[PDB]
C-alpha cells in the first residue's frame, strides 16, 4: 500500500516517472531496469543525490520524496 512515485531521468533525455515502493530496495529498482535496459548492470547505474546510494537498503529511506529525481546514468 506504499507506492512511491519517483522521477527517473534517462541520463540527459526524458524524465520518466517510475512506480516504486518503500518495501522495494534500490537493488530491486536496478533489477527492474535490468529487465528492460539490463545491458550489463555495471554499464548502467542509477544515482540520485550524487551518490550511488545503498542498494542493500530499501528505497523508502532515500526515495520517500516523490520529487526524488534519480538519474539513470551510463558508465
From Swiss-Prot:
The question of whether Thylakoid is a record keyword is answered with no
Tissue specificity remark = Detected in lymphoid cells, striated and smooth muscle, several epithelia and neurons. Expressed in neutrophils, monocytes and lymphocytes. Enhanced expression seen in pancreatic adenocarcinoma, endometrial cancer, and bladder cancer, as compared to non-cancerous tissue. In bladder cancer, the increase in expression exhibits a striking positive correlation with more advanced stages of the disease.
Q: Is the Disulfide bond keyword given for this protein?
A: yes
Compartments it resides in: Cytoplasm; Secreted
**What is its induction?**
Strongly induced upon exposure to type I interferons, viruses, LPS, and other stresses, including certain genotoxic stresses.
Q: Which UniProt keywords apply?
A: Antiviral defense, Cytoplasm, Disulfide bond, Host-virus interaction, Immunity, Innate immunity, Isopeptide bond, Repeat, S-nitrosylation, Secreted, Ubl conjugation pathway
Gene Ontology MF terms in the entry: integrin binding; protein tag activity; ubiquitin protein ligase binding
How is it modified post-translationally? S-nitrosylation decreases its dimerization, thereby increasing the availability as well as the solubility of monomeric ISG15 for its conjugation to cellular proteins. Induced as an inactive, precursor protein that is cleaved by specific proteases to expose the C-terminal diglycine (LRLRGG) motif. This motif is essential not only for its conjugation to substrates but also for its recognition by the relevant processing proteases.
Q: What is the effect of changing residue 25 to A?
A: Strongly reduces ISG15 signaling and abolishes interaction with ITGAL
May I have one GO cellular component term? nucleus
**Biological process terms in GO annotation:** defense response to bacterium; defense response to virus; innate immune response; integrin-mediated signaling pathway; ISG15-protein conjugation; modification-dependent protein catabolic process; negative regulation of protein ubiquitination; negative regulation of type I interferon-mediated signaling pathway
Tell me where in this chain the Ubiquitin-like domain is found. Answer: 1-75
Q: Hey, where's the site called Interacts with activating enzyme on this chain?
A: 75
Q: What is its main location?
A: cytoplasm
Involvement in disease: Immunodeficiency 38, with basal ganglia calcification: A primary immunodeficiency predisposing individuals to severe clinical disease upon infection with weakly virulent mycobacteria, including Mycobacterium bovis Bacille Calmette-Guerin (BCG) vaccines. Patients are also susceptible to Salmonella and Mycobacterium tuberculosis infections. Affected individuals have intracranial calcification.
Function, as annotated: Ubiquitin-like protein which plays a key role in the innate immune response to viral infection either via its conjugation to a target protein (ISGylation) or via its action as a free or unconjugated protein. ISGylation involves a cascade of enzymatic reactions involving E1, E2, and E3 enzymes which catalyze the conjugation of ISG15 to a lysine residue in the target protein. Its target proteins include IFIT1, MX1/MxA, PPM1B, UBE2L6, UBA7, CHMP5, CHMP2A, CHMP4B and CHMP6.
Q: How does it assemble?
A: Homodimer; disulfide-linked. Interacts with, and is conjugated to its targets by UBE1L (E1 enzyme) and UBE2E2 (E2 enzyme). Interacts with NEDD4. Interacts with PARP12; this interaction inhibits PINK1/Parkin-dependent mitophagy.
Present the record's domain note. Both the Ubiquitin-like 1 and Ubiquitin-like 2 domains are required for its efficient conjugation to cellular proteins. The two domains play different roles in the ISGylation pathway: Ubiquitin-like 2 domain is necessary for the first two steps allowing the linking of ISG15 to the E1 and E2 enzymes while Ubiquitin-like 1 domain is essential for the final, E3-mediated transfer of ISG15, from the E2 to the Lys of the target protein.
Q: State the protein's name.
A: Ubiquitin-like protein ISG15
Amino acid at each position: 500500500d506504499e507506492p512511491l512515485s519517483i522521477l527517473v531521468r534517462n541520463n540527459k533525455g526524458r524524465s520518466s516517472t517510475y512506480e516504486v515502493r518503500l518495501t522495494q530496495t534500490v537493488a530491486h529498482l536496478k533489477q527492474q531496469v535490468s529487465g528492460l535496459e539490463g545491458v550489463q548492470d555495471d554499464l548502467f547505474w542509477l544515482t540520485f543525490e550524487g551518490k550511488p546510494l545503498e542498494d542493500q537498503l530499501p528505497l523508502g529511506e532515500y526515495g520517500l520524496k516523490p520529487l526524488s529525481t534519480v538519474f539513470m546514468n551510463l558508465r
